[PDB]
Structure formats: C-alpha cells, structure tokens
C-alpha cells in the first residue's frame, strides 16, 4: 500500500528538517575551551561481600547506602563511608539483572529473568526486610527499574515494552508503546516528567509519563544500545552501545550532537553515567576498565582501571563526591 | 570508634558469615542450561523432576545435585550472558526431522561461537533416534535430498555399531555437529554427542559422566597441566 511510501517520505522530510536545523557542530563551538586536563581518580573503597557476578547497583540520595544485586541471589545494602553491610536480602530468583533504590530510602527494587519486579520494604517494625510487593505483568525479562516516588515505579523489560506501576494497587498504569527490539536501559529526567529508553534496535525513545506515549525518537547507533543517562539539566542524554561508541543526543534539537569513540577500543559499552556538572562522561566497557571522556571536547580524559572482569554497572552519587562501579569479579569499587 | 559503630560492625560480620555459609552451600551444587528448539523433547530428556520466567529442574545422581534451567522466552542473544558460568549447556536436537536440521545446525553454530560461551562445554543429545530409524527404513525420505554429501559419505572403519543404513545416517548426523564444534574452540571447550530415544532413562548418567569429565578438565587447567 501507499502507507509505506508516505511513511518513507515522512521520514525523509523529518531528516531534511533535522539537516536544516543543523547549522554547526558542537566541536566547532567547543574548540575554544581549554581542556579539563588529565583526570586520574583513585580507588578508596572496595566492597567484597558478593560471591557471584554483580549486575546492577544504585546510589542513595544521601550519598551513602548503595544497593547492589548479584547472581548469587543477593541484594546487599552497603554503607559506603565505612564499608559496612546494612541489609542482606535473599532473592527467590537468583537471575537478577537490575536493582533500584528509592529516593526516600524506604524501599528497594529488584528484577530479572523471572519477569517479576519485587519491591522490598527496608523500614519495618519487625526489623527485617520483607517482600513488600511483587509486579507480575511483564512477559519478558526485567532489564531496568527506577523509582518515581515511594508508590510509582517505571520498569523496562525484555518484552520490547516499558511500564509504569503503582505500588499500592499492584497494577501497571501505563504500558506505553513497544519498540522493535529488547529494551535494555532506562533513565529518568531530573524533573521526573520524561524518560528515555534505549532498545536493541539501535534506537532511543523519549517518553512522557503523563500522556503515555512516545514523544521523540533518536537513532545513529548500529548495534544494541545498552546504557542511557540524562544530562544534569535534562536537555540532553547519552547512550552507549555495542559499537564501542557513545552518542550524546540533544532533546531540543532532535538531532545527534556528539559521538565519542576511539580506534583502539572495539568492545561494547555496558554502563554510561554523567558527572554532577555534566562536563565528564563515564563509560564502562567490556575491556575490563572504565573510560572518562570530556562531554564537550570528546576526548579520553582518563581511565579507571583495576577490575579483573567485565565492568557491568556504574553510578555517580548525587553530590558528585565519588563514583562507584561494579564488575563481574564480584567487586564494587569506589573512585574519586 | 563509637559503641553504635562497633555494634554495626558486628552486624556486618554476622552478615558476612551468613553470606559465606550460603555461598558454600550454593557452591556444592552443579548448574546446567537446557537449550533446544520446540518439537525436540527437551523437557523429557531427564525423567526426574519456580516456574516464573525460567523453568527449574532439580535431579540427583550419585548424591550430586544438578539444577537445570530452561528459559521459556527468540531473543536468545541477550539473556545468554547470565549463563557464562554454568557447568554445561544441554543442547537437545531432534534428528527425526530433516527440514529443520539445517536450522538446528545454524543454532548450534551460533551457540558454539558465542562471545560469552567461550569456555562452556556442550552436551549434545540427538533425541528421537527410533523415529530416525523408522524414517530411514521407510525409504520415503532421504538425507541426500537435503545434504548431498551423504551421497558421497560412508561409515568410518573404526565404527562401533541394527541396519548399516541406520548407522551411517546416525554417524553422518553426528559428524555434522562434531565438525561444527571442532571448526572453532581450539580445545577451550569440547562437545559430547550422545544418542537418545524418547523412552531412554539413562540420560542423567550420561550428563553426570560428561560433567565429571568437564570438572576434570577444569581441575587439570587449574594445575597448569593442559
């Protein structure tokens, strides 16, 4: 039918509009700024409680009490200042791939290959962590989850869809819309009104949590997008892929802004995070260490090395005091 | 330094002790990943028998515990990364069907040459051998229609065999997978082909023997002998 033809010409004229909006590059504007210099962060804390591969972590809003999920069916809450374990939560399913820590600090979340998003309450009268709620609507493996508040959580799963859930009712509110590939990552805006999600079809999508469908679509990768993260101001985001490349897109331009890649790295990217000011971009790779790029000059400012296996997760605390990464050698390392 | 800090340290030590005990208890058991297309009898390979997400099976052979995980959801390229540390991959393939044999060979090639399955051994189960024998003595379906090399193939002289046509068809089907497995790998991980009927009951013994051999390989590589 002519629907394919009109969709094709519609894509063509969107591309022409994007080209018309592109009058210059970010590199030309940023070439006048002096470089940030060599950044060599030091490892201060090493957390050695897990006995299997660590798949996710999440910092707390108080810059301590980071939760981490490992393949031994364990969620561990760490006091990062003293390397003290606060809570150890056993999981019914040992195949956990994501974990989230509530901004209020009263709840944690986990999920994975069991297709269940389990929310655990941390502050109970009995003094032990119990399963507060379970969400069982997704038909694929859970890939990411993020807390909007104490009662709302947005999850991205391997059924090519993302969902928004209410904890009290236990039912999903908005099922959003599907990609054409497995959704691998999700990031929340600072104003908690929009969120970006990257899928396996080399596409990222900007969604609104209120109206409930996709506002914007971004492309430019040619492999699986594995990580995504907003800019601190919420007007930009960064994606990492299996192409050994990161792309900084711009929301208000709807056009791919910056590409970070190097010739000596060919392995995929697992975790992508920004600094507090947004000047530094932290990217975890499959070559057993982490890279620190300049978000404007697009050059390798530094390297965080010391992990003996694949770096699986990254996270920068709210005040930017330190960055904690977690790898497949059952280790979490804190750097500043 | 304070009293509350010391009590928190004591709580952390208790948590560490519990974690170490649970880790040793989990270290006792062995884990397997079950793979195979539909209409292949993958679920009925082991007679002895958490259904949310991944089907779970537990069976004991000679006081050794095996936990077999079967993922019920294609999109295999993503969640396979979680299973790079299992003891073995039990690949069950139906040999009675020749239409889907090439697809099964391509699937086995994809599993064998996976980036995260470099050091994971595969135990291959050529299921439904009796149906293969019935089809090859029927004479209506021929391997030469799909695999022309069977026209130029003969059974090896060192064979240890039923009808000789059954033996040559079985050895050709096995040799395809063996050639695929021996093309790559370079000794980091090997394959263990096994013939199996739908009513067989000694598959668990074969799995146990192959797992013991794999653990022997790991122990020898640990001591820098191989």
């Amino acid at each position: 039918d002519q629907l394919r033809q009109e969709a094709e010409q519609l894509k063509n004229q969107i591309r022409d509009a994007r080209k018309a909006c592109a009058d210059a590059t970010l590199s030309q504007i940023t070439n006048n700024i002096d470089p940030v210099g060599r950044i060599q962060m030091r490892t201060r804390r090493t957390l050695r409680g897990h006995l299997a591969k660590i798949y996710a972590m999440h910092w707390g809003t108080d810059s301590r009490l980071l939760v981490s999920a490992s393949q031994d069916g364990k969620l561990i809450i760490w006091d990062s200042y003293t390397t003290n374990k606060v809570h150890a939560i056993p999981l019914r399913s040992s195949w956990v791939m994501t974990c989230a820590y509530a901004p209020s600090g009263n709840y944690v979340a986990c999920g994975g290959l069991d297709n269940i998003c389990s929310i655990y309450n941390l502050k109970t009268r009995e003094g032990n962590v119990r399963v507060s709620r379970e969400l069982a609507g997704h038909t694929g493996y859970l890939s990411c989850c993020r807390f909007l508040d104490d009662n709302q959580i947005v999850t991205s799963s391997g059924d090519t869809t993302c969902a928004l859930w209410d904890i009290e009712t236990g039912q999903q509110t908005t099922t959003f819309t599907g990609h054409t590939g497995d959704v691998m990552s999700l990031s929340l805006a600072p104003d908690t009104r929009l969120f970006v999600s990257g899928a396996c079809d080399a596409s990222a999508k900007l969604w609104d949590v209120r109206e409930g469908m996709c506002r914007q679509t971004f492309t430019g990768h040619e492999s699986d997008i594995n990580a995504i993260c907003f800019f601190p101001n919420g007007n930009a985001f960064a994606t990492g892929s299996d192409d050994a490349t990161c792309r900084l897109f711009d929301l208000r331009a709807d056009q791919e802004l910056m590409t970070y890649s190097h010739d000596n790295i060919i392995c995929g990217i697992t975790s992508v995070s920004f600094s507090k000011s947004g000047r530094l971009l932290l990217a975890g790779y499959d070559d057993f260490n982490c890279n620190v790029w300049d978000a404007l000059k697009a050059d390798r400012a530094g390297v965080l090395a010391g992990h003996d296996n694949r770096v699986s997760c990254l996270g920068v605390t709210d005040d930017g005091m330190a960055v904690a990464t977690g790898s497949w050698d059952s280790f979490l390392k804190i750097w500043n | 330094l304070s009293a509350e800090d010391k009590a928190a340290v004591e709580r952390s030590k208790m948590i560490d002790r519990n974690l170490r005990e649970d880790g040793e208890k989990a270290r006792r058991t062995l884990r397997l990943l079950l793979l195979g297309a539909d209409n292949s009898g993958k679920s009925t390979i082991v007679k002895q028998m958490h259904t949310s997400g991944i089907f779970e099976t537990k069976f004991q052979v000679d006081k050794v515990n095996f936990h077999m995980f079967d993922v019920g959801g294609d999109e295999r390229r993503k969640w396979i990364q979680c299973f790079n540390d299992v003891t073995a991959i039990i690949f069950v393939v139906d040999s009675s069907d020749y239409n889907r044999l090439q697809e099964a060979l391509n699937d086995f090639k994809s599993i064998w040459n996976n980036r995260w399955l470099r050091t994971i051994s595969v135990i291959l189960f050529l299921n439904k051998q009796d149906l293969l024998a019935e089809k090859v003595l029927a004479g209506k379906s021929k391997i030469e229609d799909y695999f022309p090399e069977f026209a130029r193939y003969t059974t090896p002289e060192d064979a240890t065999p039923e009808d000789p046509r059954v033996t040559r068809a079985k050895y050709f089907i096995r040799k395809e997978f063996v050639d695929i497995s021996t093309a790559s790998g370079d000794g980091r991980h090997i394959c263990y082909p096994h013939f199996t009927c739908a009513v067989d009951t000694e598959n668990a013994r074969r799995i146990f023997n192959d797992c013991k051999d794999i653990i022997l390989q790991m122990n020898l590589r640990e001591y820098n002998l191989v």
Partner: single-chain antibody
Amino acid sequence: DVQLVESGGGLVQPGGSRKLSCSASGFAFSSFGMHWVRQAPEKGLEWVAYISSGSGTIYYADTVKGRFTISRDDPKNTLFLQMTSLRSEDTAMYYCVRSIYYYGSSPFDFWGQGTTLTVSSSDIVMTQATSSVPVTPGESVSISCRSSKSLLHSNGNTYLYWFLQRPGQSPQLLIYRMSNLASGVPDRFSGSGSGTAFTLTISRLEAEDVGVYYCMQHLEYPLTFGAGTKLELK
C-alpha cells in the same frame, strides 16, 4: 505486633538467687541487641545489662558485675537474667529493651512491661538540673539536659536519647539523637543542642504529655540515664 512479655519477679530473701525470663514475639528476635534496665521504685532509670545479636558481646553495669548474668535463647526467642546474692538495693522494677544497630537504626525503641523484684532487710554525669516543671496545656515546654563530657563524636553523631515514661506505663523512645524524631512520635516534639547542652522542645501540650522525661547518653559502654524531669498538668 511487637510483644515483649517478661516475668520472674517477686519476693526474694537477701543473698538468694532469681531467674528473670522474657519472651519475645512479633519480630525477628535473633537480629536484635537486648538490654536489661532497672529503675528504683522512687528513683529513675539505671542501665544494668546488654547482650548483642548472636551473643558475641556482653556488657554489665558496675554495680551488678559478677553477681548478674545475661543470656539469650534464640530458637525460643527468650532472654534470661540470672541474679545471685541479692542486696537491699535490688528491690526495683525491671524492663527489657529491644535495640538494633545499623546506620539509620533507632535503638531503644521498644520497652517491655517490667517485673517487680522485692528483697527483705568514668561514668558520664548525665544531669537534668530540674526536678519538675509546673505548666498548663497549650504552651511550649523546653527541657534542658547536660553531660559531664562532650557527646559529639568525630563521625558527626551525638548519641543523645530523650525518653518519656508515662505514669504507670513503660518508657518509650522520643528522640534517638539531638533531632532525629522516632517512629510514631508526633512532629510537635523536637530536640537540639550542642556537644554539652541539650534542649527538648514540645510545641503543644495535651493530656497525654504528662510524664517523666529522661536524657540518656550512648557514647561509650556504660549507659547513664538522667535524673528525670516530671511534667504534670496544673
């Protein structure tokens, strides 16, 4: 839901022996430190014994050291206090206190009913400097407390605990630091202070605010309570 029922009191001849038992229910008893706290029938509270989770740490008061023993039975959720060679000052009221310790924990939150024991015939000076305050409901009350040594620690915590005891009722935890309000306590309670001086402020007074207020320190191993300031309606 949380219940701590303790028994074993009564009349004991001097120099005798007595076992006090406490059964716990409604919470994971094996993961909690447990205290025995003694108050005289006319004086205030006085900490006696403490046993940590897993029974790896045991602390005794100096006045009862040697003749008192504390033990824990985790399968049946029970705490035991074996006392021998009782003196004349051991006639008192015994409370069993639940207390957990992690980063964001609030120790001393729950207290037991208590048992009555009757017999026949350095430490931080935690002062109150106020026997009682005559006051009417409606206004705001400030209660001061002081310590002989500065309670501020290098980690930023201060370890000051404001407790309330209603007449005829077990004490309850009001504030577990200077300002960290406890669970179930109304917002009208507040606390502040410095390394040595502390102030507890109550914005509004109802009929249930009558009782004795205690200030306790948790800086080091011996735990010393205050003299107790009594607030009553008049």
